[PDB]
């Protein structure tokens, strides 16, 4: 069972990178280093390669026929005895295939002169190069640059020409002229814009000395807190939940097939002239699968998804979903309208979107943690309401989030000062007790954890719930409003990420304990 | 075509070390425009900008121009335009010479999926003036949301996932509603802006062509001394000035300016301290006038005196588009305090009212009947009924649907 | 010749969606409705057709997919580590449980 | 209906009424939907057949279907103190094609909060991931779970319920 | 009363226009007080017209 391998030698990092206004056709058949932005990738076809005939009559192998832009196929039988020219029939078995993928890249945006349209070009991609480049991604492709006739001139079995300077002369053309394009055949291209042993065995010794000095430390948990969003002043607990939100809980899925939700959501509400979006754009720009998002509805999909109309019905991903398995940070949660919010209700507690429009019915997944920001009703929170009062949501989507945090800008003459000093302080220029990349793959590491409750820790857990309850009850009935058992299960996320904090694999009432001061001190507000 | 030098060097030095470099500059950005001295001086130091600290901040001024509609509210415009080597002229509510935002369009020919750059990006760097910012749509005011506030326009269309880096200045125009802009009303509810977009801009000048006879009377000779001419300012070597200042200069702020700067922003906020009068993002954006004005002179280094001179201008635009009483949460909300009292007042009224009632409930026009008859003026009937929002979010009144509305 | 469809669950998002043509040969017919999502299990052959080879400019052949088995997957989602082809087809044994 | 892009002619297709044909229809927020849009399952939920006569197509589909709508009373908690037709912004026609109407009250109780509370942590420990070759030992595993709650397996009770069905 | 008036630079660039073309009307250079005094009293008179009853 023989299987011949073919070899493709790839040439990387070139001296100098040209562009797609630098083609010339006087740089053909020579090696480039060409940059751009993919804007559409076809399907990964296979194109023969190295194709083996075996003719009608006789049964003579021709094999190893070079194939040309055409489908060239052999003339001549090896067997002096077979008449043949044109009748043969492929051995696919026998012949070799390889994958072809043709992509087209265009212009990079600071490329293009002003009022001019982007120039484009199709690159060809074969071999293990293929769905490398995805659209929209800027990718530096290298490789040589070809020209593609139009094989249609060149006839075809099975097409015929169809109707800017054209040659002609060749004897297979006859009185057809043939015209050429230029099209890349890329070699290259790279994009310029979980057990514990298994991430362990691919970490380096050096970062694993690192890891080994923070896993091992007694005051890790205060040292993340403070590490977290460095250039934000004070906010000490709305750091700590951001922290939580990225180590999240469990994804535990029960035996009669329903998902149990694993995703910590946040709401930082606060005055206007407060640190949201600060904390936001830190989340976007250090959480991996990240988007940052606000209220006001740009694209025309929603937050969740919508079906657009091709001049067929086909689904437009929103903000909810292309954040899938990562944190969703919407920000101006108040502006977006309440026949917005009934959007995400099931976004966030199922976590998956369902959608019946026309000819159109999935149910798409969106595993997202979302960090909204929302600005109170009447722009300045007013202490003097409970956080009902000041936000505009209602009971539904407000027991959906697990941790609230209200800061405020209280008019002291004290504190501006630090403020000003430290912003200030930055533009002239934070120290974190871990860096940002040497605190990400601690967080990568933390996230593999996977607690357990220990028999007291469920005890603890059911008592706190009760008194959280019995504190929460209203009405002549009994009714409870703020408090359901979506926050029993808010306590356990956040028992649960806050031993993957710690690093622990089991869960001790005292992580309970905080976890229930993390939900009370989000409710107490009177 | 019909249609950098050491010499340059030396006129670079020559003009840097006069006196009134400042004003030499900013007459020559509108020579053209009378008055306007302050929106002038706005304009230029908007030319050059902040430093672009990296480790996002920003480094950028943000200007709009509101005011009753202004001619130089387009003249200025087209002078900064043809003066800033980047960017493009662009209008809000046309967007017909560019779509003033990126999106994906099939290009007929080849019928291909084409990306094209709208134009906020293609102006990083160069300064993007916006025209008739008031009626742009709601989606592009979303992208203008973004960015101000991201630096980058992000895109999910067609298969197509990409942010595209936009780093752009803007400078805007809007005209008021109505006739004319009414200097007693506040700026909110003059321009028909939402104030979460007109937070966003560091410096906004209230041109106004308020009348009076005594600046008409000058204002209409220099105008006359206009229709006459047709039938020392450097003219076009700013131009490139600009350029060489935002390149080989990158000012740096010292201890002393900023010593200077928290001194000015504690003195805003106190200033008025109950109310709440300037904010962190305009400590920012002051941090970006110093920059600005280090980086014009060629000086390299922010002094002491930049920073007042910066503080200056910020006090000045906060007294021109805030109200008389400077609220600084107006801009930022359009519920101002002296409407709030309105809505916290209406609440209890309503509260109290139906417990009298039921002492039951009743729809809409019922409550409309106790509240703007007799219980006091003839005050709005949304008022009423937005309150409700808030009563319901206490959960001391429940409302039946279209018609009667109860207490729990 | 029904066309499969990469499902809006698995394709990445944003993503445009890739599919493939299957044949559904006798017996296999009428068993897929249109809309629904199905697990096609069958031999993935390739044929060379003109226009795709004029097209593309270069030797590139068509692929196609000779479904053998199809198993619908819509509506029961969650019911994944169940065997055979129809997880609420029951046995004898089965039946007399 | 749609304009079939190959043929260029009107071609009917169906919705999740008639992708649930002799099935069940699930729809969660049945209150959040559009009265326009809720209104359209009226004669599928009652005759149990979808009469489309647009674009030239006069014809009467199929739909066995069973909906099974989760709602949410006006102002997100169910008022005792009501009547039903107070709670929700449905209408009598749409409320006499459900059989069952099930209301659900979120009440406190303490001895009913211990028992729920117990059996939510109970139930969050048995799901953990973390809780002869490897195929029937994995199975044994999910079978000595299952017991524990459910009586009957439901591996075997979606066959119970197909064969009582058909 | 209307605020559809207040003089503003384009109702000047209008009335020299207008003088320009009552002028332009009569030989060449006849703008002088008498033909300002036609424009402007026909710029009155169309703003009258707006106030009219
Ligand atoms: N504690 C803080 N530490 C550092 N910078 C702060 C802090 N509080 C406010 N700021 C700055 O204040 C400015 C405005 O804060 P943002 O994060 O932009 O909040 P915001 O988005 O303006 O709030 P709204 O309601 O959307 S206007 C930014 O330049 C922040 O860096
Ligand atoms: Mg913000
Ligand atoms: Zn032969």
Redesign the pocket.
């Given at each position: 069972e023989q299987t011949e391998r073919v070899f493709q030698i790839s040439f990387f990092n070139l001296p100098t990178v040209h562009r797609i206004r630098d083609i010339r056709s006087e740089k053909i058949g020579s090696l480039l280093s060409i940059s751009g932005t993919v804007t559409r990738t076809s399907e990964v076809r296979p194109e023969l390669y190295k194709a083996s005939f075996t003719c009608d009559m006789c049964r003579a192998i021709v094999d190893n026929v070079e194939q040309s832009f055409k489908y060239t196929e052999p003339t001549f039988c090896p067997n002096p005895s077979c008449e043949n020219r044109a009748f043969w029939t492929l051995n696919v078995t026998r012949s070799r295939f390889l994958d072809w993928q043709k992509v087209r890249i265009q212009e990079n945006a600071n490329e293009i002169p002003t009022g001019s349209m982007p120039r484009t070009l199709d690159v060809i991609l074969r071999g293990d190069s293929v769905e490398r480049a995805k659209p929209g991604d800027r990718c530096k492709f290298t490789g040589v640059e070809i020209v593609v006739p139009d094989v249609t001139q060149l006839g075809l079995p099975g097409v015929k020409p169809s109707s800017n300077s054209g040659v002609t002369g060749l004897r297979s053309l006859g009185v057809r002229d043939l015209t050429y394009k230029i099209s890349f055949l890329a070699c290259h291209v790279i994009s310029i814009g979980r057990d514990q042993e298994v991430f362990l065995n691919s970490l380096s010794s050096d970062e694993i000395n690192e890891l080994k000095e923070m896993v091992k430390d007694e005051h890790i948990y205060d040292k993340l807190v403070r590490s977290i969003a460095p250039?934000?002043?004070?906010?000490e607990a709305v750091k700590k939940g951001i922290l939580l939100q990225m180590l999240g809980g469990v994804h535990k899925s029960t035996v009669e097939g329903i998902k149990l939700r694993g995703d910590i959501n946040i709401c930082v509400v606060?005055?206007?002239?407060?640190?949201?979006?600060?904390?936001?754009?830190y989340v976007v720009g250090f959480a991996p699968r990240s988007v940052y998002t606000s209220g006001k509805a740009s694209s025309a999909a929603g937050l969740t998804a919508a079906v657009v109309r091709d001049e067929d019905y086909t689904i437009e991903a929103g903000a909810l979903m292309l954040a899938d398995n990562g944190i969703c940070c919407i920000?101006?949660f108040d502006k977006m309208d309440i026949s917005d919010q009934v959007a995400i209700h099931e976004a966030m507690e199922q976590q998956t979107i369902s959608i019946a429009k026309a000819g159109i019915h999935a149910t798409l997944n969106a595993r997202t943690s979302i960090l909204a920001?929302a600005?109170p009703v009447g722009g300045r929170y007013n202490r003097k309401l409970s956080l009902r009062g000041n936000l505009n949501m209602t009971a539904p989507i407000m027991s959906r989030f697990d941790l609230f945090f209200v800061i405020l800008?209280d008019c002291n003459e004290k504190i501006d000062t630090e403020?000003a000093s430290?912003?200030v302080d930055?533009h002239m220029k934070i120290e974190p007790p871990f860096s940002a990349e040497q605190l990400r793959r601690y967080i990568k590491y933390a996230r593999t954890f996977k607690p357990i409750l220990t028999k007291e820790a469920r005890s603890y857990l059911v008592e706190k719930y009760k008194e959280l309850r019995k504190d929460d009850a209203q009405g002549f009935s009994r009714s409870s409003y703020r408090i359901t058992v979506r926050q029993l299960e808010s306590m356990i996320r956040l028992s649960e990420a806050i031993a993957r904090a710690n690093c622990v694999d089991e869960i001790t009432p005292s992580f309970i304990a905080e976890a229930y001061d993390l939900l009370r001190q989000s409710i107490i507000r009177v | 075509k019909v249609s950098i030098t050491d010499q340059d060097l030396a006129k670079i030095r020559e003009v840097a070390a006069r006196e009134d470099l400042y004003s030499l500059l900013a007459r020559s950005i509108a020579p053209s425009i009378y008055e306007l001295e302050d929106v002038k001086k706005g304009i230029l130091l908007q030319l050059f900008g902040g430093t672009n600290k990296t480790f996002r901040?920003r480094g950028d001024i943000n200007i709009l121009l509101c005011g009753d509609p202004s001619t130089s509210k387009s003249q200025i415009l087209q002078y900064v335009h043809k003066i800033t080597p980047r960017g493009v002229y662009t209008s809000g509510k046309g967007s017909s010479a560019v779509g003033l935002t990126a999106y994906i369009t099939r290009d007929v020919d080849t019928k291909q999926l084409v990306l094209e750059s709208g134009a906020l990006v293609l102006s990083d760097g160069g300064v993007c003036c916006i025209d008739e910012f008031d009626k742009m749509s709601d989606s592009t005011r979303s992208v203008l949301h973004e960015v101000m506030?991201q630096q980058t326009i992000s895109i999910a269309k067609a298969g197509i996932i990409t942010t595209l880096n936009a780093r752009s200045s803007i400078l805007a125009s809007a005209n008021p509603i109505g006739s004319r802009y009414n200097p007693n009303l506040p700026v909110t509810e003059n321009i028909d802006l939402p104030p979460?977009l007109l937070?966003?801009f560091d410096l906004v000048y209230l041109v106004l062509d308020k009348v009076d006879e005594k600046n008409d009377r000058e204002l209409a000779k220099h105008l006359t001394n206009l229709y006459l001419e047709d039938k020392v300012l450097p003219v076009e070597f700013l131009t490139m000035y600009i350029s060489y200042a935002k390149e080989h200069i990158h000012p740096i702020i010292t201890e002393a300016a900023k010593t200077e700067l928290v001194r000015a922003y504690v003195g805003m906020r106190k200033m008025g301290d109950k109310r709440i009068t300037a904010?962190?993002?305009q400590?920012?954006s002051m941090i970006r006038l110093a920059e600005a004005h280090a980086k014009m002179k060629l000086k390299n280094v922010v002094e002491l005196e930049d920073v007042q001179e910066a503080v200056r201008l910020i006090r000045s635009a906060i007294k021109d588009y805030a109200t008389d009483p400077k609220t600084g949460k107006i801009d930022?909300n359009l519920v101002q305090t002296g409407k709030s009292v309105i809505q916290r007042k209406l609440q209890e009224d309503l509260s109290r009212e139906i417990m009298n009632v039921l002492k039951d409930s009743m729809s809409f026009n019922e409550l409309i009947k106790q509240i703007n008859e007799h219980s006091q003026d003839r005050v709005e009937s949304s008022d009423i009924q937005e309150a409700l929002s808030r009563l319901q979010q206490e959960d001391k009144v429940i409302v039946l649907g279209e018609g009667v509305r109860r207490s729990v | 010749r029904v066309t499969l469809q990469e499902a809006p669950g698995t394709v990445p998002p944003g993503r445009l969606p890739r599919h493939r043509e299957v044949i559904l040969l006798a017996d296999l017919v009428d068993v897929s409705k249109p809309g629904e999502e199905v697990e096609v299990t069958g031999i993935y052959k390739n044929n060379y057709d003109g226009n795709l080879n004029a097209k593309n400019g270069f030797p590139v052949f068509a692929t196609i997919i000779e479904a053998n088995s199809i198993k619908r997957r819509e509506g029961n989602t969650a019911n994944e580590g169940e065997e055979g082809l129809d997880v609420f087809s029951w046995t004898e044994e089965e039946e007399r449980e | 209906v749609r304009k079939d892009p190959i043929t260029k002619e009107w071609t009917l297709e169906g919705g999740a009424l008639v992708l649930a044909d002799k099935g069940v229809c699930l729809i969660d927020e049945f209150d959040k939907m559009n009265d326009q849009d809720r209104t359209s399952i009226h004669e599928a939920m009652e005759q149990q057949s979808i009469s489309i006569s647009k674009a030239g197509i006069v014809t009467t589909l199929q739909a066995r279907c069973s909906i099974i709508a989760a709602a949410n009373p006006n102002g997100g908690r169910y008022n005792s103190t009501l009547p039903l037709a107070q709670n929700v912004s449905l209408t009598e026609p749409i409320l006499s094609r459900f059989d069952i109407l099930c209301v659900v009250r979120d009440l406190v109780d303490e001895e009913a909060d211990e028992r729920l509370a117990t059996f939510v942590v109970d139930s969050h420990v048995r799901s953990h991931p973390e809780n002869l070759n490897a195929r029937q030992r994995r199975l044994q595993r999910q079978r000595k779970k299952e017991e524990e709650i459910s009586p009957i397996p439901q591996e075997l009770l979606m066959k119970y319920i197909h064969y009582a069905r058909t | 009363k209307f605020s559809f008036g207040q003089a503003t630079p384009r109702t000047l660039l209008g009335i020299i226009r207008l003088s320009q073309a009552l002028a332009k009307l009569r030989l060449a250079d006849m703008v002088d007080i008498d033909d300002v005094e036609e424009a402007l009293r026909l710029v009155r008179v169309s703003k009258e017209s707006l106030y009219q009853e």
């Open positions: 250039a934000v002043f004070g906010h606060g005055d206007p002239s407060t640190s949201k979006s600060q904390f936001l754009k920000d101006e920001a600005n800008d403020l430290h912003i930055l | 901040y506030e979460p937070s966003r904010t962190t993002r400590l920012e930022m | - | - | -």
